[PDB]
Amino acid sequence: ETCPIFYDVFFAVANGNELLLDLSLTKVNATEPERTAMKKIQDCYVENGLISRVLDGLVMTTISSSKDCEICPAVKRDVDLFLTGTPDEYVEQVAQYKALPVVLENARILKNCVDAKMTEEDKENALSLLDKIYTSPLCLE
C-alpha cells in the first residue's frame, strides 16, 4: 500500500526477473544507464541464490512494517546506505531492525556484491532512478 512502485521494483530486482524490472523502469522514465545500474543490483541477487533473496526480503518487510514506518524515510535510508554507505554502516543499520546473525551475514554479502559490481557511475544512476521511483504518482498516489 505504501509506495507500490518501489515494492514492484524491489520484487523485480530481488527475484531476478529481467522483464518485470524493465516493465517497471519504463513507467518511471528510466535512462539506459539507470537500467544498467539496476540490472547490476539485480545480478547480485541472482548470483547469491534463493535463500539470500528471501532473507533480504525479510529485512525489507521488517523495516517497511516497523514502528517508525510516500516511501517510509527508514526504507529510503536503508537503500541509501546499501548503495553509498560503507558495509559496516549498512549492516549496522540492518541490525537496528533485525539483528539475527545470518540476516546480517547475508546483508554484508549482498552489500559487498553491489559495491564490487557497481561503478561510481552505476551507483549515481541507481540513486537518480530511485528518486524517479519515490516521486512517481505510482508511489505517492
From Swiss-Prot:
Q: Where in the cell is it found?
A: Secreted
Q: Where does this chain mainly localize?
A: secreted
What cellular-component terms does GO give this entry? extracellular region
Q: Give the UniProt tissue specificity note.
A: Saliva and sebaceous glands.
Under the GO molecular function aspect, what terms does this record hold? steroid binding
Could you tell me which species this protein originates from?
Felis catus (Cat)
Reply yes or no: does the keyword Signal apply: yes
Name listed for the protein in its UniProt record: Major allergen I polypeptide chain 1
Regarding protein family, the annotation reads: Belongs to the secretoglobin family.
Q: Which UniProt keywords apply?
A: Allergen, Disulfide bond, Secreted, Signal
Q: Which domain of life is it from?
A: Eukaryota
Quaternary structure annotation from Swiss-Prot or TrEMBL: Heterotetramer composed of two non-covalently linked disulfide-linked heterodimer of chains 1 and 2.
Protein's gene: CH1
